[PDB]
């Protein structure tokens, strides 16, 4: 499996109820390891996975110092964005930042990214070459110009190609018994009527890690896409995931329908049916 | 024109309130007041993320700070003590993570227990020697600036109305004149060298200039000598064809 | 407060200068500054990863893999390189500075003929001043003849339109019977000129 380290940042201006809300979370793959929350009583970057806890006080202090400096950057940002888009102070607004890096099977670098959003939409994003920017609109061109002139791309690339990958690999090694586990799906199927001559076959996958899965449905060998309902993958709350796929099916024909399950924790792919 | 500090020089007595003002154009940014001391280096006094938002450095005691506009960061000393004699620097960082700090030009502040030991300089100029003309075909003029306290001086050499740099060196630090006294006045020399042809051309004018920073023109003065205000004291020389 | 070694170095012109910093905390940027007498610190180099960011000119800087280390090299030095040099380490939002190394540059002296001259006051009087000039840069100038006689440090003046550099120290007394031979025999003068 390929691996990834990402950070997600959310700033929300609350006009007249004081300073902005700031929440920062970090992930290795589908496992969250750190949070910072500006309303939480600690004002510290906190652990959220047991393998990060073995990092010393120097790690925590430095991560707090860094994350507060993110929060201060976003606190200014909200007011500048206001001016760019000619908005008054009285309205609440959001900025989101996401950055991080990918490695492959051998843990060599794959890709790095830094994307930035204002009020839901794309604002500015760093391209895959890591040396250039995509501005979404005319306001974001003033950022793009500023960020070129300060050589922000150069500083960020040193992190994404460098520090991000080293620390990714370190976390991978220190939490090997959790991050490099695969949990296979436990699978079953349910059958439910919707009329006297129609039935729903629902194909289920539970207790699996990582979140990448692919439920498909076939009829007599060939796949059926368009009576298919696929729900969004959801957390079970214990670090594992859940998903289902459904099909509206004419009654007495459940036998010709097979559910196919692919996941990285399965040697051969699974096949469930009803006949 | 980057960062400006005001004042660049202030000599004042113990107990007096002092404000140092730092101004930048660029816009929204982080501002910092540091002090520089012979052993300690740059120690931070106070910093600022934005308007009305300041925090303490490692040595904040006896100092306050104020950020009313983004452009201004006022360092204020409500009752100046003699230990706050220093060179003070304003610095500037862009808003972000890990951005480099760019520094102002410095403010040099002298805080004294008694203002009666402030003295201006007496400046003299000395002409090159007969032996030097005949030994080396060159000619050196020395400038003495004697008997000043405190050591806030700036020495410039002027040939025919233009301030020159080639042929000069000024002593890197001033000499104590009376080292058995604690508040001893200071001396500083500098040399200007030209060719013997140049010095023996009577059309040429030489002027040594010392800018002194001492008192404001509003300060208390009961003493019999002239009030030692911030002033320029000069001494001159004309070329001589022997 | 960061560990900077050396504290002070005296180097001959044309040679190379090396200085380094040490920390105990990891930093994510390393900066190096130069300071001239009378001015502020001026940023020379900003470093962002390990390996060697090369220059504004003859200055190369490095930043340790462990992130607790940096060094500065100045090659083929020049008289205008005199000053104090500072490293800085950034932790997110603030910076910690080294203690400084003061660099001073010994100048290369082509044709040194040491001499003591007596210079006279342009405003009439017999206020006089001895000048010791044109000595080698191997020569040291000591300063003592009790408290009434003032011998300054040496510095280097530059006459570059004559391809000429020279060293100079100045001595003078109040109203004495002090003379220009009884001036620098406290020092280790070469084999020089009087009149």
């Amino acid at each position: 499996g390929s691996h990834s380290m990402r950070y997600f940042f959310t700033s929300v201006s609350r006009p007249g109820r004081g300073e902005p809300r700031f929440i920062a979370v970090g992930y290795v793959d589908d496992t969250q390891f750190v949070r910072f929350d500006s309303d939480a009583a600690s004002q510290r970057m906190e652990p959220r996975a047991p393998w990060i806890e073995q990092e010393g006080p120097e790690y925590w202090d430095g991560e707090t110092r860094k994350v507060k400096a993110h929060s201060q950057t976003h606190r200014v940002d909200l007011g500048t964005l206001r001016g760019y888009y000619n908005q008054s102070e009285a309205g609440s607004h959001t900025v989101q930042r996401m950055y991080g890096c990918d490695v492959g099977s051998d843990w060599r670098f794959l890709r790095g990214y830094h994307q930035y959003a204002y009020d839901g939409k794309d604002y500015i994003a760093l391209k895959e070459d890591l040396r250039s920017w995509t501005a979404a609109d005319m306001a974001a061109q003033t950022t793009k110009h500023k960020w070129e002139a300060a050589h922000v791309a150069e500083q960020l690339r040193a992190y994404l190609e460098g520090t991000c990958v080293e620390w990714l690999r370190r976390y991978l090694e220190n939490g090997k018994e959790t991050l490099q586990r695969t949990d296979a799906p436990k699978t079953h199927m349910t059958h439910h009527a919707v009329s006297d001559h129609e039935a729903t076959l629902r194909c289920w996958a539970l207790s699996f890690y990582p979140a990448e899965i692919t439920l498909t449905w076939q009829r007599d060998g060939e796949d059926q896409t368009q009576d298919t309902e696929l729900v969004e993958t959801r957390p079970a709350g214990d670090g594992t995931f859940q998903k289902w796929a459904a099909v509206v099916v004419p009654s007495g024909q459940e036998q010709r329908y097979t559910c196919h399950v692919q996941h990285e924790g399965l040697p051969k792919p699974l096949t469930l049916r009803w006949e | 024109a980057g960062i400006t500090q005001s004042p660049r020089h202030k000599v004042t007595e113990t107990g007096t309130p002092v404000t140092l003002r730092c101004h930048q154009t660029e816009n929204h940014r982080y501002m910092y007041w540091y002090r520089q001391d012979p052993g300690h280096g740059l120690r931070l006094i106070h910093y600022s993320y934005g308007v009305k938002d300041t925090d303490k450095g490692e040595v904040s005691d006896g100092y306050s700070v104020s950020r009313s506009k983004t452009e201004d960061f006022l360092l204020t000393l409500e009752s100046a003590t003699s230990s706050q004699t220093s060179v003070y620097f304003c610095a500037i960082s862009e808003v972000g993570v890990g951005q480099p700090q760019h520094f102002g030009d410095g403010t040099r502040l002298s805080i004294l227990e008694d203002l009666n030991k402030v003295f201006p300089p007496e400046v003299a100029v000395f002409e090159p020697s007969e032996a030097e003309i005949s030994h080396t075909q060159k000619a050196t003029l020395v400038c003495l600036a004697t008997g000043f306290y405190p050591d806030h001086v700036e020495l410039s050499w002027w040939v025919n109305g233009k301030e020159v740099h080639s042929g000069v060196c000024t002593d890197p630090q001033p000499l104590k004149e009376q080292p058995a006294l604690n508040d001893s006045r200071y001396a500083l020399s500098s040399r200007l060298r030209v060719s013997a042809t140049f010095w023996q051309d009577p059309r040429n004018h030489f002027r040594c200039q010392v800018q002194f920073y001492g008192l404001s023109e509003n300060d208390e003065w009961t003493q019999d000598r002239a009030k030692p205000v911030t002033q320029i004291v000069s001494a001159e020389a004309w070329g001589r064809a022997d | 407060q960061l560990n900077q070694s050396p504290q002070s170095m005296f180097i001959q012109e044309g040679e190379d200068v090396s200085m380094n910093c040490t920390s105990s905390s990891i930093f994510n940027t390393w900066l190096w500054y130069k300071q001239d007498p009378g001015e502020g610190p001026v940023l020379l180099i900003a470093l962002y990863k390990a390996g060697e960011l090369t220059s504004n000119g003859r200055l190369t800087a490095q930043f340790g893999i462990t992130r607790k280390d940096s060094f500065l090299n100045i090659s083929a030095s020049i008289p205008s390189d005199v000053g104090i040099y500072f490293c800085a380490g950034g932790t997110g939002n603030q910076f910690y500075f080294g203690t400084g190394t003061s660099l001073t540059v010994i100048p290369n002296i082509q044709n040194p003929d040491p001499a003591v001259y007596q210079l006279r006051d342009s405003k009439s009087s017999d206020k006089s001043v001895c000048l010791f000039t044109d000595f080698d840069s191997q020569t040291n100038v000591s300063q003592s003849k009790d408290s009434d006689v003032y011998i300054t440090d040496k510095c280097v003046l530059d006459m570059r339109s004559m391809d000429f550099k020279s060293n100079s120290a100045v001595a003078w007394s109040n109203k004495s019977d002090f003379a220009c031979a009884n001036a620098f025999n406290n020092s280790i003068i070469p084999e020089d000129t009087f009149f």
Binding site: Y99, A140, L156, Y159 | H28, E94, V97, G98 | -
Partner: peptide
């Protein structure tokens, strides 16, 4: 590890 460089205001 969060970035400690390469973040700047818009």
């Amino acid at each position: 590890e969060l970035a400690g460089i390469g973040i700047l205001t818009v």
